[PDB]
Amino acid sequence: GSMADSCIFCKIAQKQIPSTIVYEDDEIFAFKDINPIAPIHILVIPKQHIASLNEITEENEAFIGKVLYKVSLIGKKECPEGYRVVNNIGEDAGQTVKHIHFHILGGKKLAWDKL
Amino acid sequence: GSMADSCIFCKIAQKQIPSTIVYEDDEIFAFKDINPIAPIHILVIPKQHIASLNEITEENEAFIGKVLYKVSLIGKKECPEGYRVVNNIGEDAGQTVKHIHFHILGGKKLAWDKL
Ligand SMILES: Nc1nc2c(ncn2[C@@H]2O[C@H](COP(=O)(O)O)[C@@H](O)[C@H]2O)c(=O)[nH]1
Ligand SMILES: Nc1nc2c(ncn2[C@@H]2O[C@H](COP(=O)(O)O)[C@@H](O)[C@H]2O)c(=O)[nH]1
Ligand SMILES: [Zn+2]
Ligand SMILES: [Zn+2]
């Protein structure tokens, strides 16, 4: 069946499952992480379903560039003293939801610890 | 004076300062992190000098998309069991070098700890 009917982040992006919205437009949806690891922890997703960064193609690279530009616009507004962007791909990175999502982290001097 | 003459990552990208090269082409340069926080820890930079993600514009967003596509090509080769991509912007994120660089991290089940 379809991603629209099955994917948790597709549903959050269509407001079929609630979230605390930070920003949205026709292309992207940004909302607060439910289990934050920093005092500011925002997820930014495309509304369209793309499973991970490994699904970027030479053909959709421009759109992912646009998503990253919008990530920066959100980051510089919400985190004027700096922010970290994180994307997790697959098992070793702990990727849970298979709908690409950029983490925006900030609000403190963020740790840089061995992983 | 010019970035080519002053910026550590511009110089590494032109091989004016040594690094352990992972991949390069006319657009990007990827090399091993000197102080790794994971068993695979690669930095990917554009050869052109762009200071941080906050310098992405609606006009260069396509090129940054291309850089991120190439990050994914490097990640999926070097880290077939998954990888994490990190970008640090400004003080709170600990951004040291003001030449945009994507961290590719992997080679183990990566921690997800409070920052
Ligand atoms: N707001 C919200 N965040 C979620 C939900 N499900 C998962 N998350 C967050 O999504 C993130 C998934 O990141 P991943 O580990 O896949 O990179 C986690 O930080 C997790 O807490 C949800 O239903 N609502
Ligand atoms: N290979 C190499 N890595 C460097 C050099 N200088 C800084 N680095 C790495 O560059 C990264 C900078 O990341 P930042 O904290 O700015 O995101 C750090 O992980 C640091 O160890 C260098 O001269 N050579
Ligand atoms: Zn989805
Ligand atoms: Zn530079």
Side-chain angles (χ1 to χ4, degrees), chain B residues 54-90 92-96:
Chain B
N54 280 348
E55 306 306 322
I56 301 313
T57 70
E58 205 176 337
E59 285 61 51
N60 71 16
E61 66 190 18
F63 174 71
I64 208 69
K66 193 168 180 183
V67 174
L68 195 59
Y69 174 54
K70 292 184 172 171
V71 165
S72 80
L73 289 180
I74 295 162
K76 77 178 70 178
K77 173 192 179 295
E78 304 301 330
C79 302
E81 298 310 305
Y83 61 95
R84 175 174 300 160
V85 181
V86 179
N87 191 243
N88 287 316
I89 301 73
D92 277 0
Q95 188 186 0
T96 52

Coordinates of all heavy atoms in Angstrom, one line a residue, chain B residues 54-96, unseen atoms left out:
Chain B
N54 N 24.8 28.7 6.5 CA 24.0 30.0 6.4 C 24.4 30.8 5.2 O 23.7 31.8 5.0 CB 24.3 30.8 7.7 CG 23.5 30.3 8.9 OD1 22.5 29.5 8.7 ND2 23.8 30.8 10.1
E55 N 25.4 30.4 4.4 CA 25.7 31.1 3.2 C 25.1 30.4 2.0 O 25.3 30.9 0.9 CB 27.2 31.2 3.0 CG 28.0 31.7 4.2 CD 27.4 33.1 4.6 OE1 27.1 33.9 3.7 OE2 27.4 33.4 5.8
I56 N 24.3 29.4 2.2 CA 23.5 28.9 1.1 C 22.4 29.9 0.7 O 21.8 30.6 1.5 CB 22.8 27.5 1.4 CG1 23.8 26.5 1.8 CG2 22.0 27.0 0.2 CD1 25.0 26.4 0.9
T57 N 22.2 30.1 -0.6 CA 21.3 31.1 -1.1 C 20.3 30.3 -2.0 O 20.6 29.3 -2.5 CB 21.9 32.2 -1.9 OG1 22.4 31.6 -3.2 CG2 23.1 32.7 -1.2
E58 N 19.2 31.0 -2.4 CA 18.2 30.4 -3.3 C 18.9 30.1 -4.6 O 18.5 29.2 -5.4 CB 17.0 31.3 -3.4 CG 15.7 30.6 -3.8 CD 14.5 31.5 -3.9 OE1 14.5 32.5 -3.2 OE2 13.5 31.1 -4.5
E59 N 20.0 30.8 -4.9 CA 20.7 30.7 -6.1 C 21.8 29.6 -6.2 O 22.0 29.1 -7.3 CB 21.4 32.1 -6.4 CG 20.5 33.2 -6.9 CD 19.4 33.6 -6.0 OE1 19.7 33.9 -4.8 OE2 18.2 33.6 -6.4
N60 N 22.4 29.2 -5.0 CA 23.4 28.2 -5.0 C 22.9 26.9 -4.4 O 23.6 25.9 -4.2 CB 24.7 28.6 -4.3 CG 24.6 28.8 -2.8 OD1 23.7 28.4 -2.2 ND2 25.7 29.4 -2.2
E61 N 21.6 26.9 -4.1 CA 21.0 25.7 -3.5 C 21.1 24.4 -4.3 O 21.4 23.4 -3.8 CB 19.5 25.9 -3.1 CG 18.6 26.1 -4.3 CD 17.2 26.6 -3.9 OE1 16.9 27.1 -2.9 OE2 16.3 26.5 -4.8
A62 N 21.0 24.5 -5.6 CA 21.2 23.4 -6.5 C 22.6 22.8 -6.4 O 22.8 21.5 -6.3 CB 21.0 23.7 -8.0
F63 N 23.7 23.6 -6.4 CA 25.0 23.1 -6.1 C 25.2 22.4 -4.8 O 25.8 21.4 -4.7 CB 26.1 24.3 -6.3 CG 27.5 23.9 -5.9 CD1 28.2 23.0 -6.7 CD2 28.1 24.3 -4.7 CE1 29.5 22.6 -6.4 CE2 29.3 23.9 -4.4 CZ 30.1 23.1 -5.2
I64 N 24.6 23.0 -3.7 CA 24.7 22.3 -2.4 C 24.0 21.0 -2.4 O 24.4 20.0 -1.7 CB 24.3 23.2 -1.2 CG1 25.0 22.7 0.1 CG2 22.8 23.2 -0.9 CD1 26.5 23.0 0.2
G65 N 22.9 20.9 -3.1 CA 22.2 19.6 -3.4 C 23.1 18.6 -4.1 O 23.1 17.4 -3.7
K66 N 23.9 19.0 -5.0 CA 24.9 18.2 -5.7 C 25.9 17.7 -4.7 O 26.3 16.5 -4.8 CB 25.5 18.9 -6.9 CG 26.3 18.0 -7.8 CD 26.6 18.7 -9.1 CE 27.4 17.8 -10.0 NZ 27.8 18.6 -11.3
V67 N 26.4 18.6 -3.9 CA 27.4 18.2 -2.9 C 26.8 17.2 -2.0 O 27.5 16.2 -1.7 CB 27.9 19.5 -2.1 CG1 28.8 19.1 -0.9 CG2 28.7 20.4 -3.1
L68 N 25.6 17.3 -1.5 CA 24.9 16.4 -0.7 C 24.7 15.0 -1.4 O 24.9 13.9 -0.8 CB 23.6 16.9 0.0 CG 23.1 16.2 1.2 CD1 24.0 16.1 2.3 CD2 21.7 16.8 1.6
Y69 N 24.3 15.0 -2.7 CA 24.3 13.8 -3.4 C 25.6 13.1 -3.4 O 25.7 11.9 -3.2 CB 23.8 14.1 -4.9 CG 23.8 12.9 -5.8 CD1 23.2 11.8 -5.5 CD2 24.5 13.0 -7.0 CE1 23.2 10.7 -6.3 CE2 24.6 11.9 -7.8 CZ 23.9 10.8 -7.5 OH 23.9 9.7 -8.3
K70 N 26.7 13.8 -3.7 CA 28.0 13.2 -3.6 C 28.4 12.7 -2.3 O 29.0 11.7 -2.2 CB 29.1 14.1 -4.2 CG 28.9 14.4 -5.7 CD 30.0 15.2 -6.3 CE 29.8 15.2 -7.8 NZ 30.7 16.2 -8.5
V71 N 28.0 13.4 -1.2 CA 28.1 12.9 0.2 C 27.5 11.5 0.3 O 28.1 10.6 0.9 CB 27.6 13.9 1.2 CG1 27.3 13.3 2.6 CG2 28.5 15.1 1.3
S72 N 26.3 11.4 -0.3 CA 25.6 10.1 -0.2 C 26.3 9.0 -1.0 O 26.3 7.8 -0.6 CB 24.1 10.3 -0.6 OG 23.9 10.3 -2.0
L73 N 26.9 9.4 -2.1 CA 27.6 8.4 -2.9 C 28.8 7.9 -2.2 O 29.2 6.7 -2.2 CB 28.0 9.0 -4.2 CG 26.9 9.2 -5.2 CD1 27.4 9.8 -6.5 CD2 26.1 7.9 -5.5
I74 N 29.5 8.8 -1.5 CA 30.7 8.4 -0.7 C 30.2 7.6 0.5 O 30.8 6.6 0.8 CB 31.5 9.7 -0.2 CG1 32.1 10.4 -1.4 CG2 32.6 9.3 0.8 CD1 32.5 11.8 -1.1
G75 N 29.2 8.1 1.2 CA 28.7 7.4 2.4 C 28.2 5.9 2.1 O 28.6 5.0 2.8
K76 N 27.5 5.7 1.0 CA 27.0 4.4 0.7 C 28.1 3.4 0.3 O 27.9 2.2 0.5 CB 25.8 4.4 -0.3 CG 26.2 4.6 -1.7 CD 25.0 4.6 -2.6 CE 24.1 5.9 -2.5 NZ 22.9 5.9 -3.4
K77 N 29.2 3.9 -0.2 CA 30.3 3.1 -0.6 C 31.1 2.8 0.7 O 31.4 1.6 1.0 CB 31.2 3.8 -1.6 CG 32.6 3.0 -1.9 CD 33.5 3.9 -2.7 CE 34.9 3.1 -2.9 NZ 35.7 2.8 -1.7
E78 N 31.6 3.8 1.4 CA 32.4 3.6 2.6 C 31.7 3.0 3.8 O 32.3 2.4 4.6 CB 33.1 5.0 3.0 CG 33.8 5.7 1.9 CD 35.0 4.9 1.3 OE1 35.6 4.0 2.0 OE2 35.3 5.1 0.1
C79 N 30.4 3.3 3.9 CA 29.6 2.8 5.1 C 28.4 2.1 4.6 O 27.2 2.6 4.8 CB 29.3 4.1 5.9 SG 30.6 5.1 6.5
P80 N 28.5 0.9 4.1 CA 27.4 0.2 3.6 C 26.3 -0.3 4.6 O 25.2 -0.5 4.3 CB 28.0 -1.1 2.9 CG 29.4 -1.2 3.5 CD 29.8 0.2 3.7
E81 N 26.7 -0.3 5.9 CA 25.7 -0.6 7.0 C 25.1 0.6 7.7 O 24.4 0.5 8.6 CB 26.4 -1.6 8.0 CG 26.9 -2.9 7.4 CD 25.8 -3.6 6.5 OE1 24.6 -3.8 7.1 OE2 26.0 -3.9 5.3
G82 N 25.4 1.8 7.1 CA 24.8 3.0 7.5 C 25.8 4.1 7.9 O 26.9 3.8 8.3
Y83 N 25.4 5.3 7.8 CA 26.2 6.4 8.2 C 25.4 7.6 8.6 O 24.2 7.7 8.3 CB 27.2 6.8 7.0 CG 26.4 7.2 5.7 CD1 26.2 8.6 5.4 CD2 26.0 6.2 4.8 CE1 25.5 8.9 4.3 CE2 25.3 6.6 3.7 CZ 25.0 7.9 3.4 OH 24.3 8.3 2.3
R84 N 26.0 8.5 9.3 CA 25.4 9.8 9.8 C 26.1 11.0 9.1 O 27.4 10.9 9.1 CB 25.5 9.8 11.3 CG 25.0 11.1 11.9 CD 25.1 11.0 13.5 NE 24.2 9.9 13.9 CZ 24.3 9.3 15.1 NH1 25.2 9.7 16.0 NH2 23.5 8.3 15.4
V85 N 25.4 12.0 8.7 CA 25.9 13.2 8.1 C 25.6 14.3 9.0 O 24.5 14.5 9.5 CB 25.3 13.5 6.7 CG1 25.9 14.7 6.1 CG2 25.5 12.2 5.8
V86 N 26.7 15.1 9.3 CA 26.6 16.2 10.3 C 27.2 17.4 9.7 O 28.3 17.4 9.0 CB 27.4 15.9 11.6 CG1 27.3 17.0 12.6 CG2 26.8 14.6 12.3
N87 N 26.5 18.6 9.9 CA 27.1 19.9 9.5 C 26.9 20.8 10.7 O 25.8 20.9 11.3 CB 26.4 20.4 8.3 CG 27.1 21.7 7.7 OD1 26.5 22.7 7.6 ND2 28.4 21.5 7.3
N88 N 28.0 21.5 11.1 CA 28.0 22.4 12.2 C 28.0 23.9 11.7 O 28.8 24.2 10.9 CB 29.2 22.2 13.1 CG 29.1 20.9 13.8 OD1 28.0 20.6 14.4 ND2 30.1 20.1 13.9
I89 N 27.1 24.7 12.3 CA 27.0 26.1 11.9 C 27.1 26.9 13.2 O 26.3 26.9 14.1 CB 25.6 26.4 11.3 CG1 25.3 25.6 10.0 CG2 25.5 28.0 11.0 CD1 25.0 24.1 10.1
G90 N 28.2 27.7 13.2 CA 28.5 28.7 14.2 C 28.8 28.2 15.6 O 29.2 27.0 15.8
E91 N 28.7 29.1 16.6 CA 29.4 28.9 17.9 C 28.8 27.8 18.7 O 29.5 26.9 19.1 CB 29.2 30.2 18.7
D92 N 27.5 27.7 18.8 CA 26.8 26.7 19.6 C 27.1 25.3 19.1 O 27.2 24.3 19.8 CB 25.3 26.9 19.8 CG 25.0 27.9 21.0 OD1 26.0 28.4 21.6 OD2 23.8 28.2 21.2
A93 N 27.2 25.1 17.8 CA 27.6 23.9 17.1 C 29.0 23.5 17.2 O 29.4 22.4 16.8 CB 27.0 23.8 15.7
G94 N 29.9 24.5 17.5 CA 31.3 24.3 17.6 C 32.0 24.4 16.3 O 33.1 23.8 16.1
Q95 N 31.4 25.1 15.3 CA 32.0 25.2 14.0 C 33.4 25.8 14.1 O 33.5 26.9 14.6 CB 31.2 26.0 13.0 CG 31.8 25.9 11.6 CD 31.1 26.8 10.6 OE1 30.1 27.5 10.9 NE2 31.6 26.7 9.3
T96 N 34.4 25.1 13.7 CA 35.8 25.7 13.8 C 36.1 26.3 12.5 O 36.2 27.5 12.4 CB 36.8 24.5 14.2 OG1 36.6 23.4 13.4 CG2 36.4 24.0 15.6

